[PDB]
Ligand binder design. Structure first.
Ligand SMILES: [Cl-]
Ligand SMILES: [Cl-]
Lengths: 386, 386
């Protein structure tokens, strides 16, 4: 779904990836990241957010919770890293990086609450009073006051599998009263997910009922004198959606895919953020008239559709399509329409979440200058490969 | 699907896991491995195979391509490691371990063929003449002769997504002639997958058409004087299936799940190999009457059905069931029937392939002696966590 955008916005990345593969420097099932471009994208996001006075936390899950990229991006002026789960937080803390937000989308396990509080986490999102009590106890024991966000929801919200969580709007005042009575805590604000979603029919990113629930919650609380310093509204945060967030009084947002240009608003390759990643594989074998490339990077919600096949003998690039993929079996290989020579290179570009796949992540700098150089190699879980 | 077997064969593992979690030593989304038991299972497999004269290669993908376990198991007398793909081979070679078989289920990428040949790989499976030519060239350049296996298939075989590969039976003689003419190669034999499959209706592991195709291929080749030193017949290799393999003249087999007792023949917990793994999680939150545990370990083909919930205040264990899981969205959490306290521990036991998930792998020794001790912590891709 991003091959069109890749061809338009970053053909140099295609050339660099293929060149490095031909040199034997990039193995199949690797996402190749244009470091020059991701940093440019990150800067544009910061400059845009600054005008609106919106603070940004960096989301890294989609590019494989990569600590090298996280460190370089943080240096652009981001307020900290938002860790989707405790394993992502683990990568960041091991790297010596600040974690600004933990608890969303995934809560902090009981035996890790004290570490999150003691090591320093700007805000912690809680989904239950029992978890809030755990955070309060840890804060008191550490002689600190921990800021928290509350995840809210209402019955008309978009509630996705794995994200069914939070305090119902009908009980929010009772919850807030409890939170304000816990000694270890400071109620900093609210969050929800997803707050914005791409609408294909309209052709725009639009607010979701979830965002309206967040606003309604803020407004209800304001009637009882509750002032909230943080309204955190993630999902599809990008340069062109930031003004929309600003209109709703959002104070904090969390770019993830925007950093690599891989947002649904960019399918025509016309957004300020340019495509900064592609997936490289190679032809393994043929079977009954079709070619199969090494798998490992397949993502069910990715809308992978188009593939480029590079044959180094003649340096030819041919477009073909992915055939239907069985989501029930492990993706050892992926089917491509048509026969291509064994050991030809393959390029795809689609929406992924690297952290739930087993792809390598290869960091390439200097593409803007025409001097591509590999500056890092990592796995999908954030480990260096050396 | 293995909770019954776990309760019968290894209740000590349940007790050890919960005890260590209560001590704050095992985080949610960890497979806890009984080292004493996996090594006992590995020994039983070796002793059984030896009587039949079948050689065993160790398959490690399902327990997270773990190099610590691989090394300890190899020491029991295994002929080497079979690496499912080139990333698994990467873990093993970095650990300084011998790789006996590469190429099945996944081929060797072109820029890695020379390393596989030069570093030493007992047999390499090829799916195409072009890959065979690559191996031959590499062998000649390295002044070696490389043994190869051919993957065969026929149209009535069980051919699963990701495993659609090999030479058709109708062209095998032509292929073998070509292979025998390539200077770098020695034709060692044949392989296929799956060669055995559990049959739930019958209640036995049975040969598949794939195994019959392998035998037919061997017999056809024998008519033209081709002698094959290796008939490699993987899938459901275990203590009770080894005599069946022996009856077909299989020379090499490849236990994976048998090492941990997590084979479909063991649902009643009556096989020689005892359950040696469980998955530990924890209650994150509640939503609309149900509890949600941390995810990360879900496997679509795993038949996860039953969960044990441990509440440390009273030390009570309660069985509940997993609710229906949406396989399309990321498993940040998993739904459990009923409400349980936040931060209660959760135990599951089901068929997994750790390498395609993001679970930790925690190695616990001394369970047989009643002195459980953590001797290693790894991620799902084989990296040490420290
Ligand atoms: Cl070519
Ligand atoms: Cl309890």
């Amino acid at each position: 779904m991003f091959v069109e955008a890749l061809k338009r916005q970053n053909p140099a990345l295609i050339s660099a990836a293929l060149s490095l593969w031909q040199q034997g420097k990039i193995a199949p099932d690797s996402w190749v990241i244009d470091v020059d471009q991701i940093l440019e994208n990150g800067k544009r996001l910061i400059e845009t957010a600054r005008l609106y006075g919106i603070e940004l936390y960096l989301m890294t899950k989609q590019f494989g919770r990569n600590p090298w990229l996280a460190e370089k991006l943080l240096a652009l002026g981001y307020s900290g890293i938002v860790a989707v789960d405790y394993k992502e937080a683990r990568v960041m803390r091991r790297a010596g990086l600040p974690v600004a937000h933990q608890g969303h989308l995934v809560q902090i396990p009981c035996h890790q609450v004290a570490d999150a509080v003691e090591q320093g986490t700007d805000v912690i999102t809680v989904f239950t009073l029992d978890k809030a009590r755990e955070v309060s106890a840890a804060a008191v024991k550490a002689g600190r006051i921990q800021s928290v966000l509350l995840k809210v929801y209402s019955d008309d919200d978009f509630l996705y599998p794995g994200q069914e969580s939070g305090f119902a709007l009908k009980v929010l005042p009772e919850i807030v009263a409890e939170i304000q009575n816990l000694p270890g805590l400071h109620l900093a604000g609210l969050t929800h997910f997803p707050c914005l979603l791409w609408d294909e029919a309209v052709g725009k990113v639009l607010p979701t009922p979830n965002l309206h629930t967040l606003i309604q919650a803020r407004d209800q609380l304001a009637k009882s004198g509750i002032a909230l310093e943080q309204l955190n509204a993630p999902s599809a945060t990008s340069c062109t959606s930031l003004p929309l967030l600003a209109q709703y009084g959002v104070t904090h947002a969390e770019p993830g895919h925007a950093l690599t240009g891989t947002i649904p608003a960019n399918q025509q390759g016309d957004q300020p953020e340019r495509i900064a990643m592609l997936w490289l594989s190679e032809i393994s074998h043929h079977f009954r008239g079709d070619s199969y490339c090494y798998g490992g990077g397949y993502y069910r919600r990715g809308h992978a559709q188009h593939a480029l096949v590079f044959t180094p003998e003649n340096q030819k690039i041919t477009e073909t399509n992915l055939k239907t993929v069985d989501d029930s079996s492990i993706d050892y290989t992926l089917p491509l329409a048509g026969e291509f020579p064994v050991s030809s290179a393959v390029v795809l570009c689609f929406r992924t979440q690297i952290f739930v796949t087993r792809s390598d992540v290869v960091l390439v700098s200097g593409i803007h200058r025409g001097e591509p150089e590999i500056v890092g190699r990592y796995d999908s879980l954030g480990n260096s490969l050396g």
